[model samples]
Target: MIAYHTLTKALLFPDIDQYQHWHHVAPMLAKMLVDGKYSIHQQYEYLCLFAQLVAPVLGPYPSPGRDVYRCTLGGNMTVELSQNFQRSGSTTRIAFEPVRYQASVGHDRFNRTSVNAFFSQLQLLVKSVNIELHHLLSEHLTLTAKDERNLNEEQLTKYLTNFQVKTQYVVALDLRKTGIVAKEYFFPGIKCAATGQTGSNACFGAIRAVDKDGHLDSLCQLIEAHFQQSKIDDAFLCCDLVDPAHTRFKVYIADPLVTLARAEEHWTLGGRLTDEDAAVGLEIIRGLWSELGIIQGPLEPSAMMEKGLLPIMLNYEMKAGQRLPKPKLYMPLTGIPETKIARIMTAFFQRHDMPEQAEVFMENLQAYYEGKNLEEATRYQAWLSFAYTKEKGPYLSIYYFWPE
Candidate 1:
């Protein structure tokens, strides 16, 4: 367990200050795997390899005076643990933005030499684990490029330059599988334009300058129809190009209005059973509030807003042959007391027949909140949501944040 914590600390929080609060959360994650029949020794081996692969990008420990930037998985890394009560066990996933120093430190353009060096290191690292580098590059670039030839690092760097890769290149790892089995990359859609081009090609044929694909436009129309009153200017697109069979187009509404009024408004803007779906979604929210002891009365929009129970983000996902996208909600756990959160989550896990997980989660929450004030403890600490899909099936996903 300590070994897992050490590797996690090294991989995610080389800066001890960042590791201080997450001490227990890190090891407890490993404990969850152990509880699910995975051996600690095997976990340590995989984690060590993962840490080594990204060591070049992590660079040396950060210092106050040093202005040189290191490529980090976003400004922070998020660990998502999802539990399906009907399933035998839970799944652990981690995502981070791989922001290059050129982008993070304000360089207008990416240096080819630097980009090549960074990917070269990663290529070699993954090769050691029997994973090919081409598997990590976005398929959008390969499919849309001018020439239909062999793909290589040079071509990837060229595509990166064309895509204007400034930031928001996300890499997600699924730790449950052996040898980093499931990996994915998400690229920013708006910046995917070629030089002197008016539109982007990174959208996977969703958005273009001419011969426009109506998918993105239609999705935006839906978003405008639903979130018209809320802020939607910053709404942007993201594409996951891994596994051509499962390519996804996503739109993110960072500040969403998920209140009773919004739900009623959606109901009023009715379609066939769309109103009923909205009503059911509201009931789900109300039920969750009751379970967490956030409210007692009939769910009121104002009261939910006051308690910060409203979902902070509303995102949608679509794939081939899917006419409409599926919406997913995200609710932040910030501003809630750790003790109350532990109690609520403990009850949740216990009710689901996961007493071991309940105890582990409570202990992890306590350790994470220890020696920190309310503001320090609560900020960007965790988020909770349900996957409203048949495959996911009422499972609750808890996302824990660790900022860089």
Candidate 2:
């Protein structure tokens, strides 16, 4: 087995309190509890509930289930070109741009924005997401003493009002995806529908971030897998996240306050605000990290690629030493498939290896156009590929769902 992994390390991000942050007109979220509001213990449950509310009119939300969500939220980069393949049996090529692989990219940003602004407008589940899922799944598992019993009365009451608040899922979302009453009032679709796929100008909201108190913990665990290309089993993060001491979900739930504390602690640590250049806003985080004097090594790469961790993991290539034409893959898509599947995908990354992914694409594509499957097709009347690489350097053809 070949093991090529990218190195993703865990950086502990201190949590901040929500109420105080809100009091300051600061978003308790946008920075933390990413990848959906980390307020609830059940992440998927949260999404499942949110889906039913909006999918009716807006569109399907992000899910691990299919490429539909993936396409909308996490679509991948594509090359552009202009030509008619049917008439001339030819085409042209263009440049590459960042894109989502599926559409899983905007889940979290959409959640808080839609949920908060529309909490009164839209009907939420009669029961909360976590309670519903737990109620539905409770009977399946038998609890053990060593394991965990249900939360006692005090814990239950605390949960309803203070659990999430205390835990810190206190961030608001950047609602730049769909058209809102607010945007329609002030801006055109230019701001609302930035990407405008399908001849429409609009960007889908699906980028996921993790910023719970236990966020660092979950990030650490994922980093271990990301660079390692490992799978997360039962990713169904329930109440029992990590050990009793550091449960991932609870940590996320409690992170806003943690972040708040860090923010205050950041001030307490050191650094005086400039006089002539006195700053009141964004300059704060700098104060915190600097005061602690914990920053080290290179962080530019991490900061730049923070949201694209998935793609980075997919594109990672293993090698023996520094050499040319390394046999690696550039998935540019997240969640690299192990085994034979990815070997085929990787073949697309290296120019020297383009013929590999290229050949397979052409074969299947021709079969698809001719109303047949490549494997079953009889005649090999010249096969080729590169869905986005038409008429330029790599291949003889290409097609994109959108125009450049």
Candidate 3:
């Protein structure tokens, strides 16, 4: 066991064998918990029952010699499983070795202890899920260019630590499967970290991720744009003497190193705010994303849609579940990496002149003013070159010479 300081990270894992333990278990778990199916009590009961029956590889139990049975099974996820393919089968095996010094209590006593510990911890999970659900229900957030980024940090953390195990350990398992990690190098957070803010402390922001090329899809692009802008704002906020560095919301993404941790684990956190104002600001962003159609439309959908190159006569429409190649590009803020990414994107928006044709085509939380007949268009064109990948394009004159 490793000591997990608030400043350090740990590896946590989940009971990976349960779904396969009972047929249709996966779907049931999904319906009840993941999809919020069963009532809260029902969901909690379901997990306990399943965990009990699962191969015992999951801890808080006794094996033949009173060793805990835990899972490090294969087929949990294809990508996660496939990543571990390099080992020679003969050498690969899971062994449950009792810590040499651990005392063996009599059978009845052992079972009693295990069950009690398991249930005690389970009660905590019940409370946690309830708190999370309340937060979800009480809030009706839309998401913003930045809000989306903010979401990544919280989401990734929750996804990692929320369930039966913590995510850092899960991700370390990802590396282990790839032969890039060691058995001795463990994810310290699986059991206890999720109970605390374990994932939030890991940061050292010099984040760099890409898909083989320097260019990232729209999603990554969005994250980077916000990050770049965020650093600027964070710097400004840092210099301000009035801001209490802790327990207070400072402008811009507060931490970059942890942002890097997300990328290192090949995951994201979304964002975090200690209180209500942060949540409300994010709600405004959510509203904007919805209005922009970025939430339900092209950003996640139509952008990836492939209309085959065909004669105008061959019209087509796509429907849900119809398979198609996914969009090659993704948004920078696709996954929340930092709390400040949204504020940074907003900062970016503020620095530039609003787009000219933007008024007619774009929808945002707040409408742009100045009644756009002409002049601002000229200056907006100049600012266009700086954010060229955006629809504004390289030269402003492109707007003037349009066929329309």
Candidate 4:
């Protein structure tokens, strides 16, 4: 066997046959403990059953022996498994360590284990245990027989890890399959990074995700965003989406990196979004976006969205699935009645050039306002704009335009 620290990563791989064995068996072991279907005692019973069946399979650690099985498959793995079950009673203890690339009995030489089993018996043992565990889950989770067949190990593992880690302020897996995400259903917490605070509540500086690419693709975007905003090395957080569908409630960090090992450690600590505050802040941005006018000097951003586009992009850091397209342009209906705002808009339209018309309109407007005892009725200077792709040209957006 290679020394633990001395072995290269390539040696971690097992034979093609063993690949099937480990993959098939590992998920069930992950399931019972994570599923919440079985008690610690029940989980321990299943572990013992597997150990008894596979224990002899792990003997003969030297040449021609299953040293890897001894170090991982049935022996040391059993010890760790039992320890986790024991940990269930502790309020603060994380139940299980995240599954490692290669299982190990010790850290002094974490990656150097040997395999010594004859192919036929090992495969048989793994399949038998997997079947039994699946049936057991069917009984425990109240799942139908067909559902047992459909059980997804990867999904189970994800749920399990998330069940244990429990973080806060995660951008959960979106409900995109339901067509458009309703504006009301959108959580502003997802966009907390935009304003550097969680809308006056607290800072949930860390982010969490578990996309199909583990957290790699997600982390790339996050780190890219963070780095783009800085010239020097800095720190940010992206916890693995233990339960991508459900955000975790708490976690801790030193502020960087999202590797599986790093994320698991951070996740185990646990995190929280302030109630309604983050969401409110996000909506405020959306409303502001709809009403704010830009006074740019002719240079247009390369991507000016066309009005009335289908499935328009949502603002405040939302995405269409994994691909985040630029959001579409939106100009809300002006609250002021058309006739009132129209007069004010005309004043700015050519006030500098049409002095006579502007003076006459202003005098009439002032008289109307004074009659109504309204003094601030001329608050029309701060307007909005939208440089859309249309024949109408640039349009002004109005928020609090005063009308007599």
**How do all models score by TM-score?**
0.61, 0.18, 0.19, 0.19
RMSD of each: 9.2, 24.7, 25.0, 28.3
| lDDT agreement with native, every candidate | 0.45, 0.22, 0.23, 0.26
lDDT, candidate 4, 1-404, per-residue tens:
11111222222333443333333333334342333234545444443433333333322222234433222112122111211111112010111111222332343121112111221333353332112211221121222334335555554444333222111111111112111110101122212222223311221222222223343334334433433342212211222222233322221112222122222222211112122433333343343342332212111212111211111111213222432211112232222233454455455435224344333434433432344433333232222322212243222322222221
lDDT of 1 by residue, 301-385 (tens): 4454445343455456655566555665555565566566666766767765677767676555544345454334443345666
Question: Considering only N, C-alpha and C atoms within 3 Å, which residue pairs clash in candidate 1?
Answer: 73-97, 74-97
Counting clashing residue pairs in each candidate, in order, gives 2, 59, 52, 15
Q: Is candidate 1 or candidate 4 better by lDDT?
A: 1
User: Which residues of candidate 3, in runs, are more than 4 Å off?
Assistant: 1-57, 61-167, 171-210, 213-218, 232-404
Q: What is the lDDT of candidate 1?
A: 0.45
What does candidate 3 score in Cα RMSD to the true structure?
Answer: 25.0
Ranked by TM-score from best down, the candidates are 1, 4, 3, 2
lDDT of 3 by residue, 136-205 (tens): 2111111213333434445546544322222121111111112211111112222222233221121101
Query: Runs in model 1 with CA error above 4 Å?
Result: 5-37, 63-88, 99-166, 178-234, 256-260, 263-281, 289-311, 350-356, 367-376
What's the TM for model 1?
Answer: 0.61
Stretches > 4 Å off in candidate 2? 1-311, 314-330, 333-363, 366-404
Between candidates 2 and 4, name the one with more favorable TM-score: 4
Task: Write model 2 residue lDDT over 7-62, tens digit each, in one string.
Answer: 00221212222122121111111111121223333222322322233223222322
Q: Where does the lowest 10-residue lDDT sum fall in candidate 2?
A: 199-208
On the 0 to 100 scale, the lDDT of residue 190 in model 3 is 27
